[PDB]
Amino acid sequence: ERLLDELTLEGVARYMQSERCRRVICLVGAGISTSAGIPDFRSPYDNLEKLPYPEAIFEISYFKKHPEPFFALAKELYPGQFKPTICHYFMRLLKDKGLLLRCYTQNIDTLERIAGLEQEDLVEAHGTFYTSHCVSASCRHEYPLSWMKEKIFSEVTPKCEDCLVKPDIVFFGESLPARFFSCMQSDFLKVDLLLVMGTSLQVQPFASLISKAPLSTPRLLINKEKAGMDFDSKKAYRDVAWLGECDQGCLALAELLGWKKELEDLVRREHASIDAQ
Numbered sequence: 001e002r003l004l005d006e007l008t009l010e011g012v013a014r015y016m017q018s019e020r021c022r023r024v025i026c027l028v029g030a031g032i033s034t035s036a037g038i039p040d041f042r043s044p045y046d047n048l049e050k051l052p053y054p055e056a057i058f059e060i061s062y063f064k065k066h067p068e069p070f071f072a073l074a075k076e077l078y079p080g081q082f083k084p085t086i087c088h089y090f091m092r093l094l095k096d097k098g099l100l101l102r103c104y105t106q107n108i109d110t111l112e113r114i115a116g117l118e119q120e121d122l123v124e125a126h127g128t129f130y131t132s133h134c135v136s137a138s139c140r141h142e143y144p145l146s147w148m149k150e151k152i153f154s155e156v157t158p159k160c161e162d163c164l165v166k167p168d169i170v171f172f173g174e175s176l177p178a179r180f181f182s183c184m185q186s187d188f189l190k191v192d193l194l195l196v197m198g199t200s201l202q203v204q205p206f207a208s209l210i211s212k213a214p215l216s217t218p219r220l221l222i223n224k225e226k227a228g229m230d231f232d233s234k235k236a237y238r239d240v241a242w243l244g245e246c247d248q249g250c251l252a253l254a255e256l257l258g259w260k261k262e263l264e265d266l267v268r269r270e271h272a273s274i275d276a277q
């Protein structure tokens with residue numbers, strides 16, 4: 001069927017306000033973090049000049065051999081703060097309002113957790129920095145963020161005190177976490193809305209999630225560029241694209257839903273609180 005009254009942000013807002021919209025899944029990427037200062041890497045180079053090919057800084061095999069590049073960049077690009085964005089806190093609001101079924105994230109910055117999404121709400125599709133593991137299969141010693149953070153800027157390779165210690169991120173050529181496949185099996189059977197934010201759906205198998213929803217489920221993309229989705233054909237019925245930055249899009253949606261002050265209120269204290277530390 002066709003559930004949206006209009007293929008626009010406004011039509012999506014009206015749907016979200018209705019009794020029909022009970023379960024929402026968010027699929028998110030780099031764009032939701034860029035106003036928090038987290039680097040994108042969708043489309044960088046000069047800084048890397050000191051690797052056999054550029055992408056190998058993000059590659060599993062090279063990492064095991066030559067870990068220090070990656071760890072050097074991690075120091076270079078380490079945010080001085082971790083302030084979740086308007087977009088992160090919009091998902092927090094969905095959680096508070098009993099709408100958020102799951103957030104599938106391509107991001108490794110831990111900002112969803114900081115905005116108050118719980119483990120059960122999240123599928124960290126590309127792993128996380130929140131926790132790091134010894135590569136030794138007979139050991140697999142676990143170390144926290146603060147140990148990994150402290151090691152990284154000391155420009156020393158992190159090593160296991162019992163045995164290399166890797167952040168739990170999925171490097172190119174590495175298979176995705178079990179939790180991705182188990183959640184995806186049931187999450188999409190009964191979902192009323194997909195909110196796709198800050199991703200161009202370029203990485204697989206993350207990109208395939210959008211086709212998992214029922215044919216009737218509306219899908220809103222909030223992204224800098226267009227990116228199974230049919231926004232513009234004579235047969236378009238359920239997909240809407242809002243092009244621009246994620247913070248501005250979520251703000252416009254919040255404003256349409258009557259959540260603008262609420263969202264603003266949430267961001268202000270959460271930020272000012274983080275400041276105090």
Ligand SMILES: *C(=S)NCCCCCCCCCCCC
Nearest residue numbers: 058073074077108126169170171
């Ligand atoms: C896959 S699309 N993304 C998951 C992140 C792991 C692969 C890229 C490594 C990023 C370099 C780390 C920069 C330090 C902030």
Ligand SMILES: [Zn+2]
Nearest residue numbers: 134139160163
């Ligand atoms: Zn170990």
